[PDB]
Amino acid sequence: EVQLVESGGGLAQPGESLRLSCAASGFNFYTYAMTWVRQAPGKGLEWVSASSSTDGTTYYADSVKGRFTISRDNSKNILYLQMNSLKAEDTATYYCARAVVFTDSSAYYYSKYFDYWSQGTLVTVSSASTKGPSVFPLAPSGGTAALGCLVKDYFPEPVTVSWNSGALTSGVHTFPAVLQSSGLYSLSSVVTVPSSSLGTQTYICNVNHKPSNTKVDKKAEPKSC
Amino acid sequence: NTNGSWHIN
Amino acid sequence: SYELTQPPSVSVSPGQAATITCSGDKLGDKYVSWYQQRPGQSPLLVVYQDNKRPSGIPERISGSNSGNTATLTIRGTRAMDEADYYCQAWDSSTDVVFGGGTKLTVLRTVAAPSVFIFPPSDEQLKSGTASVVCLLNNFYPREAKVQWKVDNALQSGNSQESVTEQDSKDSTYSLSSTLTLSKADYEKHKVYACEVTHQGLSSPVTKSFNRGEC
């Protein structure tokens, strides 16, 4: 079973450095070119860099040449991406991907594809400081009731939300984050439930903002009377 | 395959 | 300098075949691979070397490359097929080159939103700010208008909205709108309402609450 786990990354100041790592297993790392591909928020896929399997050769997109350095350790099944002199344009989700490069008599003809991808890690390049979010309940003051949690004032992205520790998944809507004029993100997570289950069935949102090490459980119920 | 070679030449 | 061209969006009815085009000069001798990227997920290889299919990918998804246009076709489109699709090739000038991507929209029947309003929590009120939330749930098409009214006064620009991607089972959208006020401004008014306009609604729909009142 092919596995690629990415580490490092997160938040960094412009001009500073970050180093990504990609740990690999379940395949013959010695026979595969290993790559970095990134995606700017809401934008398309862009190839960043490649490392050949055994000859030590390295390849870069024009956008990153000189600032970024890919390297590998076959004896350890690890790919690294040293990212120096970071810019706002470097803000993106970075994926490490195993590539397949094919048998051509001469060059000029190429078949390069990415058959396995890591989950991806967000790299934010900003002067703004890490802030943990506040978690507030969203509750009503017909047959269907809506409940939720407002995850307000955090930086950088991302946050994750589950309900009832993952036991409640149907009717869940976790909205894309909106950046407020303050330079802090905010997001809401909601769930629709039968009105007759309120004060009978307990509903709790589990929020996690790994960048600030914040983990909150908030009960979403109507205001007591 | 190129057996892991990204580019040849 | 070499570029791969994709339409920014493609719409298809369920059970119909969606066709995503990929264009580039002299595409005939190039090998095109395709990636499916579902919301919040890593890209997934769906086609490699113009027309080859990986193991795990359904028979419905197949690739093609004839002339200067590469083609991704999905037989009998289902709601779970809503995703961003990327074509990818190689060129001496760029090395690995990607298309801009194409969002696949699933065409379903009109669905009116269900509307909900949430007062700010007494807890947040201690911080000096009040957030009022309006939820527009399970609607189609994406276009909807949310208007905030405070003591019947139409609110301008003190709100922000967010829309989900098309739902993977029912092809609807949901929208959240947040009205932000200072605690002092919030306490100065009684009636907070969100008024919703949408193609599926024969009149505007308003949800409200009175500040305080349990």
PDB file of C-alpha atoms in Angstrom, chain A residues 32-144:
ATOM      1  CA  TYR A  32      10.799   6.376  -8.562  1.00  0.00           C
ATOM      2  CA  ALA A  33      11.226  10.082  -9.262  1.00  0.00           C
ATOM      3  CA  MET A  34       9.649  12.054  -6.307  1.00  0.00           C
ATOM      4  CA  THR A  35       8.016  15.463  -6.729  1.00  0.00           C
ATOM      5  CA  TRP A  36       6.434  18.593  -5.118  1.00  0.00           C
ATOM      6  CA  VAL A  37       3.285  20.131  -6.654  1.00  0.00           C
ATOM      7  CA  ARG A  38       1.469  23.120  -5.114  1.00  0.00           C
ATOM      8  CA  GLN A  39      -1.912  24.833  -5.295  1.00  0.00           C
ATOM      9  CA  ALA A  40      -2.459  28.502  -4.357  1.00  0.00           C
ATOM     10  CA  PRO A  41      -5.833  28.913  -2.476  1.00  0.00           C
ATOM     11  CA  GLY A  42      -8.689  28.662  -5.012  1.00  0.00           C
ATOM     12  CA  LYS A  43      -6.151  28.360  -7.891  1.00  0.00           C
ATOM     13  CA  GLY A  44      -4.829  25.525 -10.090  1.00  0.00           C
ATOM     14  CA  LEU A  45      -2.145  22.842  -9.824  1.00  0.00           C
ATOM     15  CA  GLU A  46       1.515  23.899 -10.382  1.00  0.00           C
ATOM     16  CA  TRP A  47       4.554  21.607 -10.580  1.00  0.00           C
ATOM     17  CA  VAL A  48       7.329  22.848  -8.263  1.00  0.00           C
ATOM     18  CA  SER A  49      10.226  20.442  -8.257  1.00  0.00           C
ATOM     19  CA  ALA A  50      11.484  16.915  -8.978  1.00  0.00           C
ATOM     20  CA  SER A  51      14.303  14.638  -7.716  1.00  0.00           C
ATOM     21  CA  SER A  52      15.444  11.646  -9.884  1.00  0.00           C
ATOM     22  CA  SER A  53      15.643   8.233  -8.111  1.00  0.00           C
ATOM     23  CA  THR A  54      19.438   7.501  -7.996  1.00  0.00           C
ATOM     24  CA  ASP A  55      21.664  10.004 -10.006  1.00  0.00           C
ATOM     25  CA  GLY A  56      21.182  13.010  -7.655  1.00  0.00           C
ATOM     26  CA  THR A  57      19.716  15.254 -10.444  1.00  0.00           C
ATOM     27  CA  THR A  58      17.178  17.976  -9.422  1.00  0.00           C
ATOM     28  CA  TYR A  59      14.574  19.988 -11.428  1.00  0.00           C
ATOM     29  CA  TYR A  60      12.648  23.208 -10.731  1.00  0.00           C
ATOM     30  CA  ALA A  61       9.870  25.415 -12.038  1.00  0.00           C
ATOM     31  CA  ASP A  62      11.230  28.889 -13.062  1.00  0.00           C
ATOM     32  CA  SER A  63       9.071  30.451 -10.275  1.00  0.00           C
ATOM     33  CA  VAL A  64      11.058  28.688  -7.465  1.00  0.00           C
ATOM     34  CA  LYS A  65      14.647  28.239  -8.960  1.00  0.00           C
ATOM     35  CA  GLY A  66      17.380  29.434  -6.541  1.00  0.00           C
ATOM     36  CA  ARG A  67      15.011  29.791  -3.535  1.00  0.00           C
ATOM     37  CA  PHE A  68      13.859  26.137  -3.280  1.00  0.00           C
ATOM     38  CA  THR A  69      16.007  23.017  -3.008  1.00  0.00           C
ATOM     39  CA  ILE A  70      14.684  19.449  -3.340  1.00  0.00           C
ATOM     40  CA  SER A  71      16.793  16.574  -1.964  1.00  0.00           C
ATOM     41  CA  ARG A  72      16.223  12.978  -1.089  1.00  0.00           C
ATOM     42  CA  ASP A  73      17.550  10.194   1.081  1.00  0.00           C
ATOM     43  CA  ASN A  74      16.953   6.786  -0.533  1.00  0.00           C
ATOM     44  CA  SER A  75      18.423   5.026   2.569  1.00  0.00           C
ATOM     45  CA  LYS A  76      15.642   6.738   4.637  1.00  0.00           C
ATOM     46  CA  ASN A  77      12.732   6.940   2.039  1.00  0.00           C
ATOM     47  CA  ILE A  78      12.373  10.707   2.565  1.00  0.00           C
ATOM     48  CA  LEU A  79      11.997  13.709   0.227  1.00  0.00           C
ATOM     49  CA  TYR A  80      12.726  17.233   1.423  1.00  0.00           C
ATOM     50  CA  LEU A  81      11.850  20.686   0.126  1.00  0.00           C
ATOM     51  CA  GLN A  82      13.942  23.474   1.583  1.00  0.00           C
ATOM     52  CA  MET A  83      12.026  26.706   0.922  1.00  0.00           C
ATOM     53  CA  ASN A  84      14.193  29.814   1.350  1.00  0.00           C
ATOM     54  CA  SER A  85      13.327  33.551   0.792  1.00  0.00           C
ATOM     55  CA  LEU A  86       9.545  32.886   1.025  1.00  0.00           C
ATOM     56  CA  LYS A  87       7.133  35.249  -0.805  1.00  0.00           C
ATOM     57  CA  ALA A  88       3.308  35.773  -0.628  1.00  0.00           C
ATOM     58  CA  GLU A  89       3.062  33.935  -4.064  1.00  0.00           C
ATOM     59  CA  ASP A  90       4.475  30.813  -2.280  1.00  0.00           C
ATOM     60  CA  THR A  91       1.271  30.631  -0.084  1.00  0.00           C
ATOM     61  CA  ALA A  92      -0.246  27.289  -1.157  1.00  0.00           C
ATOM     62  CA  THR A  93      -1.086  23.671  -0.284  1.00  0.00           C
ATOM     63  CA  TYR A  94       1.975  21.590  -1.074  1.00  0.00           C
ATOM     64  CA  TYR A  95       1.682  17.952  -2.133  1.00  0.00           C
ATOM     65  CA  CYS A  96       4.410  15.432  -2.445  1.00  0.00           C
ATOM     66  CA  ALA A  97       3.820  13.067  -5.290  1.00  0.00           C
ATOM     67  CA  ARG A  98       5.349   9.957  -6.698  1.00  0.00           C
ATOM     68  CA  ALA A  99       5.959  10.381 -10.442  1.00  0.00           C
ATOM     69  CA  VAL A 100       6.121   7.978 -13.376  1.00  0.00           C
ATOM     70  CA  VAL A 101       8.503   8.983 -16.281  1.00  0.00           C
ATOM     71  CA  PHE A 102       8.457   6.857 -19.500  1.00  0.00           C
ATOM     72  CA  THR A 103      10.699   4.968 -21.977  1.00  0.00           C
ATOM     73  CA  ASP A 104      11.577   7.196 -24.953  1.00  0.00           C
ATOM     74  CA  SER A 105      14.237   6.169 -27.635  1.00  0.00           C
ATOM     75  CA  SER A 106      15.488   9.819 -27.753  1.00  0.00           C
ATOM     76  CA  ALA A 107      14.138  12.847 -25.734  1.00  0.00           C
ATOM     77  CA  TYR A 108      11.474  15.445 -26.993  1.00  0.00           C
ATOM     78  CA  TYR A 109       8.724  12.755 -26.313  1.00  0.00           C
ATOM     79  CA  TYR A 110       7.642  12.494 -22.636  1.00  0.00           C
ATOM     80  CA  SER A 111       4.974  10.848 -20.479  1.00  0.00           C
ATOM     81  CA  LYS A 112       5.225  12.167 -16.884  1.00  0.00           C
ATOM     82  CA  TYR A 113       2.340  11.558 -14.454  1.00  0.00           C
ATOM     83  CA  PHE A 114       1.714  11.688 -10.625  1.00  0.00           C
ATOM     84  CA  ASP A 115       0.096   8.379  -9.587  1.00  0.00           C
ATOM     85  CA  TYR A 116       0.096   8.821  -5.801  1.00  0.00           C
ATOM     86  CA  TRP A 117      -0.272  12.089  -3.856  1.00  0.00           C
ATOM     87  CA  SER A 118       0.160  13.025  -0.188  1.00  0.00           C
ATOM     88  CA  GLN A 119      -2.792  14.625   1.713  1.00  0.00           C
ATOM     89  CA  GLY A 120      -1.163  18.069   1.300  1.00  0.00           C
ATOM     90  CA  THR A 121       0.194  20.711   3.700  1.00  0.00           C
ATOM     91  CA  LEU A 122      -0.708  24.402   3.763  1.00  0.00           C
ATOM     92  CA  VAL A 123       2.155  26.904   3.629  1.00  0.00           C
ATOM     93  CA  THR A 124       1.104  30.461   4.568  1.00  0.00           C
ATOM     94  CA  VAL A 125       3.645  33.304   3.914  1.00  0.00           C
ATOM     95  CA  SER A 126       2.539  36.313   6.042  1.00  0.00           C
ATOM     96  CA  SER A 127       3.639  38.978   8.553  1.00  0.00           C
ATOM     97  CA  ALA A 128       0.409  38.180  10.578  1.00  0.00           C
ATOM     98  CA  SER A 129       0.691  36.318  13.923  1.00  0.00           C
ATOM     99  CA  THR A 130      -0.830  32.939  14.997  1.00  0.00           C
ATOM    100  CA  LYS A 131      -4.163  33.319  16.856  1.00  0.00           C
ATOM    101  CA  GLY A 132      -6.328  30.588  18.323  1.00  0.00           C
ATOM    102  CA  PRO A 133     -10.056  30.796  17.582  1.00  0.00           C
ATOM    103  CA  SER A 134     -13.035  31.468  19.839  1.00  0.00           C
ATOM    104  CA  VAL A 135     -15.867  28.891  19.573  1.00  0.00           C
ATOM    105  CA  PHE A 136     -19.420  30.126  20.036  1.00  0.00           C
ATOM    106  CA  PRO A 137     -22.642  28.118  19.892  1.00  0.00           C
ATOM    107  CA  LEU A 138     -25.186  28.783  17.102  1.00  0.00           C
ATOM    108  CA  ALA A 139     -28.671  27.883  18.396  1.00  0.00           C
ATOM    109  CA  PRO A 140     -32.299  29.000  17.655  1.00  0.00           C
ATOM    110  CA  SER A 141     -33.812  31.674  20.044  1.00  0.00           C
ATOM    111  CA  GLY A 142     -40.988  24.202  12.120  1.00  0.00           C
ATOM    112  CA  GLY A 143     -40.034  20.506  12.210  1.00  0.00           C
ATOM    113  CA  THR A 144     -36.312  21.065  11.378  1.00  0.00           C
TER     114      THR A 144
END
